[PDB]
């Protein structure tokens, strides 16, 4: 089933959907997983996430061109941490119209980050504007509230069973809700909550460290942000 290309691992999950994993080390935390997904609408490519390096996401690109060959029309990115953004250089540099969070873009020099080249809102519901968003096809994001970041945001893919949690939504089995230095832990449950209610026949939960999952993962994480208050 997994796919290792080069440094990278890909796992196809729906006949139009793949999800892309790459890998950094983290001192103190080994060599960590991070996964986003790629999305064949017709005649093009949709990205959801980098990964976490320049040289990962050119990688990316090029298994996109091997196996599916098409152009990658667009990639949104679910928050401002490496793993999700670090490689938006190298989208740039192949042409690729690049989308985040307004909170995301504005973060980002400070993360470290390089901007994309625009930026979603949401309105008060957590529905993306959808003049924000233009030809998105399948790909339906929503803002769940504050919980793994203040900007993170989440993705339906239209016509499948999958939705992405990106770092808000860790497996049924996690043991802890990974790096909260940038949580909003006040909120973090409701938030997770809020993801499951957003996507309720979504029964593959993607998500950024973890394989695919059950709606358990959703059920479990926000039973551990219960525990944060
Ligand atoms: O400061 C951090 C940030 C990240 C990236 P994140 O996954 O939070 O987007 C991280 C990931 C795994 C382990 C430790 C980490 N420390
Ligand atoms: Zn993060
Ligand atoms: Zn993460």
Known sequence: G?????????????????????????????????NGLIVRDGGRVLVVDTAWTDDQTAQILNWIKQEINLPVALAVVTHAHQDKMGGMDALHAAGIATYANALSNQLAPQEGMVAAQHSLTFAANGWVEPATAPNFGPLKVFYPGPGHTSDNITVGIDGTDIA???????????????????????????????????????????????APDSRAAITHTARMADKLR
């Open 164 to 210: 992405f949690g990106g770092c808000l939504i860790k497996d049924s089995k996690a043991k802890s809700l990974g790096n909260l230095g940038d949580a909003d832990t006040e909120h973090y449950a409701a938030s997770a909550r809020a993801f499951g209610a957003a996507f309720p026949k979504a029964s593959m939960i993607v998500m950024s460290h973890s």
């Open 2 to 34: 997994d796919q290792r290309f080069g440094d990278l691992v890909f796992r196809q999950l729906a006949p139009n959907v793949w999800q892309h994993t790459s890998y950094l080390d983290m001192p103190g935390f080994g060599a960590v997983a991070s």
